[PDB]
Structures are given as C-alpha cells and as structure tokens.
Design an enzyme around this catalytic site. Structure first.
Site, PDB file in Angstrom:
ATOM      1  N   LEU A  23     -54.157   1.687 -46.095  1.00  0.00           N
ATOM      2  CA  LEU A  23     -53.483   3.068 -45.765  1.00  0.00           C
ATOM      3  C   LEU A  23     -53.320   2.932 -44.424  1.00  0.00           C
ATOM      4  CD1 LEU A  23     -56.201   5.357 -47.046  1.00  0.00           C
ATOM      5  CD2 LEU A  23     -53.934   4.941 -47.941  1.00  0.00           C
ATOM      6  N   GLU A  30     -58.368  14.488 -44.855  1.00  0.00           N
ATOM      7  CA  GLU A  30     -57.263  14.269 -45.971  1.00  0.00           C
ATOM      8  C   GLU A  30     -57.973  13.522 -47.227  1.00  0.00           C
ATOM      9  OE1 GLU A  30     -55.433  11.972 -48.212  1.00  0.00           O
ATOM     10  OE2 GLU A  30     -54.126  13.721 -48.851  1.00  0.00           O
TER      11      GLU A  30
END
Ligand code: NDP
Ligand code: N22
Length: 225
Positions: A23, A30
């Site tokens: 990521l 999140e």
C-alpha cells in the site's frame, strides 16, 4: 442474493492503490474503518466474506491473516476449483466469478453470509466492476505540504463512473449499524472533482469514506421460459 461490495482506499485524482506490491501509505484510522466494516454485521449470527487475489493475500502480514472473524477467500488460477476449504478461515478458488456463484448458494451458505466484500487487489477490482453491487471507496488526498506517493496500481475510475454513481448521502445507513464514524457528511471540491463523504485526517492526508451504487438500468430483456 447476498450484496457484493468492492471496498478499496484510493488516492485522488488517479485513484492509485498500490506500489511494488504494498500500500502506498499506512493510515491506522483507514485500516480501522476497513476492519470494522468488513467484520461487523447487522445480524450477529452471520459473518461477511472477504475475497482477494493471491498477490493481496501474500502482502498481508503473516500474523494478521487470515483476517479474523471473516470468511477469507483467496483466488489464484493455480488453485483446484471454484471454492475449496484449505485451512480454518481460508478458502481457495481458481475463479473470482465461480466463487461468487458458489458463495451465493443458499444451500451452501445457509443464509449465514451477510455481505461479500471484494478487498483487492488491482487485477481483482478490474474484474469486479461488473460484479459488484456497490463500492465503498476511501478517497485519499495529500494535504498541501504532503508529497504525493509513487504508485503503480490504480482503480478503473472510468469504469467506476460509467456504471455507478456517488451515493455517499446513504453511506451511514449502508454501514453496519454499530460502526461509529468521526466525521459528518461533507462535500468539498478538490482539483475540480466533487469529493463527498465522511472526512478524516491522518498523518499527511485527508480522506473521505464514500459509497458508490449501481446506476438505474433500463429494462431491455428479462429471461422467460
Ligand atoms: N488500497 C487498497 O485498498 C488495496 C490495495 N491493494 C494493492 O493492490 C496491489 C495488488 O494488486 P495486484 O498486483 O493486481 O494483484 P491482486 O491482489 O489483484 O492478485 C492478482 C492475482 O490474483 C489471481 N487472479 C486474478 N484474477 C483471477 C480470477 N478471475 N480467478 C482466479 N484468480 C485470479 C492471479 O493469481 P495467480 O498469479 O496465483 O494465478 C493473479 O496474479 C498491491 O500493491 C496492493 O497493496 C490491495 C488491496 C487493497
Ligand atoms: C488498506 C486497508 C484497506 N482499506 C480499504 N478501504 N479497502 C481495502 N480493501 C483495504 C485492504 C486490504 C487488505 C489488507 C489487510 C492488511 O492487514 C490487515 C494489510 C494489507 C492489506 O492489503 C494490501
């Protein structure tokens, strides 16, 4: 019969989602949202499924997979067939489409799946635009002093916005009722696009939780016997 929802975090405006197999950010609020949404259900007798591609699964830290309290399905073309238990919590499928058909069987699933969430990665989301009923997209924007991260994997925003509309007015009602969100519903323009949803900030980013839902479709044919 079970809703199919893709869920993803993407950096505007290109909707980047990954770089070099990982990521491009580490945002605990999140991750918490993704955890709570995919784990919680309205019916405590049900669980949700998370379906992911093989490279997504290999990227999740070993001590954190399979993702707890959700049925995990990993898809690879090297696997044996459409939906096979391989370990506790873990099914393997050699077909995204046939696993969805298999999971939708009330005889197999005992009506104990509440939702199916497709949780990545890029190759899997490419194939999901015609399978998902909704998308839960966290729209991430770097704050003004923040360096935009390098990325190499992107959500297909053209095909998103062909097929679905921004339904973020209805996000709080769509999420399982025990989730609690910090923001209130906010509409902000950012580099010429309307960003609408529930805002948070973390580290050098602002991000909005949003809901997209399939556009209405004309009635061209219904199959008759
Ligand atoms: N920002 C976010 O919300 C997320 C971002 N990501 C990011 O995405 C990236 C990973 O995406 P990507 O590299 O595209 O890989 P994927 O995670 O999409 O996995 C692709 C693999 O899935 C298998 N596969 C693809 N389609 C099918 C199908 N129809 N049936 C059965 N198997 C299939 C193949 O496995 P095989 O080769 O074994 O045959 C293929 O190589 C990483 O950067 C990751 O961090 C991932 C999830 C969430
Ligand atoms: C990155 C958290 C996330 N957010 C949203 N909105 N959608 C998603 N599909 C995901 C994800 C994911 C998979 C995952 C879990 C993890 O540790 C538990 C680590 C890496 C992950 O994916 C690359």
């Amino acid at each position: 019969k079970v809703p199919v929802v893709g869920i993803v975090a993407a950096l505007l405006p290109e909707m980047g989602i990954g770089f070099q197999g990982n990521l491009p950010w580490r945002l605990a609020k999140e991750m918490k949202y993704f955890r709570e949404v995919t784990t919680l259900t309205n019916d405590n007798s049900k669980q949700n499924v998370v379906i992911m591609g093989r490279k997504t699964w290999e990227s999740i830290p070993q001590k954190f997979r399979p993702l707890p309290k959700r049925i995990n399905v990993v898809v690879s073309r090297s696997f044996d067939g459409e939906l096979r238990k391989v370990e506790d919590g873990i099914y393997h499928s050699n077909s995204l489409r046939n696993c969805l058909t298999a999971l939708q069987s009330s005889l197999a699933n005992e009506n104990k799946i509440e939702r199916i969430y497709i949780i990545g990665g890029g190759e899997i989301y490419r194939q999901s635009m015609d399978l998902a009923d909704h998308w839960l997209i966290t729209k991430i924007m770097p704050l003004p002093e923040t360096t935009i991260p390098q990325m190499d994997t992107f959500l297909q925003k053209q095909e998103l916005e062909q097929r679905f509309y921004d339904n973020s007015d209805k996000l709080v009602d769509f999420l399982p009722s025990s989730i609690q969100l910090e923001g209130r519903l906010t509409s902000q323009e950012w580099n010429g696009e309307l960003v609408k949803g529930l805002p948070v900030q973390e580290k050098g980013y602002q991000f909005y939780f949003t809901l997209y839902t399939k556009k209405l479709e004309h009635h061209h044919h219904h199959h008759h016997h």
